Write a protein that binds this DNA or RNA. Sequence first.
DNA 1: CCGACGTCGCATCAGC
DNA 2: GCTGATGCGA
DNA 3: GTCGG
Length: 318
Amino acid sequence: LNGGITDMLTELANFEKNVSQAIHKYNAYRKAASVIAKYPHKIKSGAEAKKLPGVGTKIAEKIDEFLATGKLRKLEKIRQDDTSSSINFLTRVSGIGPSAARKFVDEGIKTLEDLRKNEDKLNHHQRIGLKYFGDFEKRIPREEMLQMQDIVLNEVKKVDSEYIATVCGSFRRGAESSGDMDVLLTHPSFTSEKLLHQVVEQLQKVHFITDTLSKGETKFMGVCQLPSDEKEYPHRRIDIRLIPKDQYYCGVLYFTGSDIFNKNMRAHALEKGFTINEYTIRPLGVTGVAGEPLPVDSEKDIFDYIQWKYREPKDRSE
DNA sequence: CCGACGTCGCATCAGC
DNA sequence: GCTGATGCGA
DNA sequence: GTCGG
Ligand SMILES: Nc1ccn([C@H]2C[C@H](O)[C@@H](COP(=O)(O)NP(=O)(O)OP(=O)(O)O)O2)c(=O)n1
Ligand SMILES: [Mg+2]
Ligand code: NA
Ligand code: NA
């Protein structure tokens, strides 16, 4: 409905993050683009827009300019700027953030072609990002996510039948496609008071996991691909997080999302005397002092503690 | 007016 | 060599 | 850039 406005605010958001290194301004523009994306009328003026939470004076002014001229001078200008447009573009490679993109552009390295002929100036993550630049920008249809899930749940059970693994994120909520696969792993032997490596190893042995971005005792980030004389599947981003059993369901709730649904839930639990981080749910004592983590054995437990009726993953976009 | 705005695991760098 | 900081993508 | 104490 207001596609021109929300694209403009998303573009400005990227320049803030990537060129100006102004992360809070990036988040501001994104919040503004979001609140406007959901607004159920075609906007007529910046003043109409300013009524929304996240839209302030300068964005109301920007909308005014867009509506009257169909563009924004400042944006048109930065788009045409070689240095800035190249900086913003390089950050599309995974592992090249604002700072590595600035340095490349400083020394004349501006395009994927230039990155291709300068491998030795790329760290390991950035090579993998460049290798899969196009793949990493595709979404994953549900059907492939389900085949991916089949492999992961199978290999994980085969390594030790007492692992518990859950694929979270937009997939756990039932979305028709997904940007990545987030797997949450726990084992009854691991609580708060080798397990990851065994799983990653087995997924590599069956050639499901094809590259490693980073790997510690608790978190793996990397790349995987379904088996193929039909055209091969795109490489996909996979994360595997190993979480102590007593924190597993807080992890699951959180890494299931949505973004927005998380936020309300956290707020609802405040205005109920509980604090929910990704790890624990804790009570707030009569003056804001957090007490001990409360036992949690399922998602539902958390929902009870704060008297909300267990909400299905599919019903969690807010 | 003026500070918050999410917090953290891992890879790699910067300082010693 | 060791420790803390910073970049990055969550 | 926006919000709010
Ligand atoms: N800023 C953020 C980002 C993520 N999250 C939580 C909720 C998300 O569903 C979950 C995973 O983040 P995500 O993978 O970027 N988004 P999600 O999987 O829901 O959708 P897609 O990856 O399919 O685009 O972490 C959050 O609470 N705040
Ligand atoms: Mg996701
Ligand atoms: Na990047
Ligand atoms: Na990016």
